[PDB]
């Protein structure tokens, strides 16, 4: 096989079009991506035109987190009621506008001090389910020591997200960084998988971007594909970033990246 139709057939596979959204923006809750909440897909197609329009952030191991959610095939999110006693929740920012108001990532709770007191937070979450939980949390990096003190009443914030198997400790990096939507600060995003029977543990003294719940980790038969090809009304079992392709011939030279039953390369 050597030619492609140029379009991605919406059948028989479940095709979810990202449009102006990446997977991580839909994962975190960028207000332009709220329409992607809880969505299921067999193949999720990221676009080149996808862009971030919320609070500026990085993900240290971006490639692997993008692989976990892509395989689960779902963005299903179940809220949990953490006991954030003594802190101000629902932190908002003018860089992440939702419905003409200052907002933030839908799936993230940015905690600030309460009455200029912000105590050592300790929360346990048991994961009594029969399936892997994916917790998404972050670390805020204030621009100045003045910004650190004003937000958290703590010059040296520390964060530790632990389980019975793993532990992650992150320290903020105070400093100036190029203004993104008028924000010289940033946020580092991390994730933790809590397997059934294991407890999620959080030990934040400052700067925490608290999670709001978990994502379900399903059987990884789904995947992700970078492609600019349009989504079309047709039926084809093989899918390549150049478009859908028939699977009658035994070999193909269109693209090495494929999804579904495809000819060998």
């Amino acid at each position, epitope marked *: 096989q050597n030619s492609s139709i140029g379009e991605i057939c919406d059948s028989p596979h479940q095709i979810l079009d990202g449009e102006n959204c990446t997977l991580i923006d839909a994962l975190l809750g960028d207000p332009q991506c709220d329409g992607f909440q809880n969505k299921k897909w067999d193949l999720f197609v990221e676009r080149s035109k996808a862009y971030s329009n919320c609070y500026p952030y990085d993900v240290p191991d971006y490639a692997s987190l993008r692989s976990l959610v892509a395989s689960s095939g779902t963005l299903e999110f179940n809220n949990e009621s953490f006991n954030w006693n003594g802190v101000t929740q629902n932190g908002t920012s003018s860089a992440c506008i939702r419905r003409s108001n200052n907002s933030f990532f839908s799936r993230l709770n940015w905690l600030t001090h309460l009455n200029f007191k912000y105590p050592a937070l300790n929360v346990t979450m048991p994961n009594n389910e029969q399936f892997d939980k994916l917790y998404i949390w972050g670390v805020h990096h204030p621009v100045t020591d003045k910004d650190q003190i004003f937000l958290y009443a703590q010059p040296s914030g520390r964060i530790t997200v632990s389980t019975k198997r793993s532990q992650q400790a992150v320290i903020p990096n105070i400093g100036f960084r190029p*203004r993104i939507r008028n924000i010289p600060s940033r946020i580092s995003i991390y994730w933790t998988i809590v397997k059934p029977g294991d407890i999620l543990l959080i030990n934040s003294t400052g700067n925490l971007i608290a999670p709001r719940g978990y994502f379900k980790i399903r059987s990884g038969k789904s995947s992700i594909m970078r492609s600019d090809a349009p989504i079309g009304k047709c039926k084809s079992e093989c899918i390549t970033p150049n478009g859908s392709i028939p699977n009658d011939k035994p070999f193909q030279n269109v693209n090495r990246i494929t999804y579904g039953a495809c000819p060998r390369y």
Partner: antibody
Amino acid sequence: EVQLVESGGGLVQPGGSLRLSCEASGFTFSNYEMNWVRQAPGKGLEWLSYIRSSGTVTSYADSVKGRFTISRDNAKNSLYLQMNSLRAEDTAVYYCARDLVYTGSYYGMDVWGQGTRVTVSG
Amino acid sequence: AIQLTQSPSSLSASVGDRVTITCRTSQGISTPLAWYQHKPGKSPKLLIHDAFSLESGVPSRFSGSGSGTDFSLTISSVQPEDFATYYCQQFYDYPITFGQGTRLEIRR
């Protein structure tokens, strides 16, 4: 016109010192963060240093931190880079550039210096 | 530090084509990348928003897309004066870092 004129480049012995100047005109020098960038012959662009518009806020590339020093004088609309303990690899064409911050978001370095050559050789 | 890898290093494109250059980050970032045109014997200029395009007219023929890890620079119509060595830079976190550069080679 928006100008960033550069001066101070030349030939210098290894271990010697040299100072560069990026005089600005056309825009308000007091509001832009200034940068020093170089490319060595046969190499690509290399960011070196940066000052904030208010001064006293600097950081350096690891290649030159401890040797070079960036500085600002808003009164004379000029940027200075003090180069000390110069080595052979420091031979490059040094550029100066401001940060474009339209509305509230950074877009890149729009206005660039003309280029000034520093050759470290015996 | 955030490191960039740029692909390809050399590129020969015929006139009037559409050419895309890719840069990849070591760490995923939400901010886009900035691109530069480096003519021989000239200072590099900002590509994505040249001259006073933000203050004045929006139209331009250099497109810079990509979020996360893979970003791209697209030239809508290759012209005989596009010969340069293009560079990409990230502005998420200092130190500011560039790529190895892509030398476009207009073909006649």
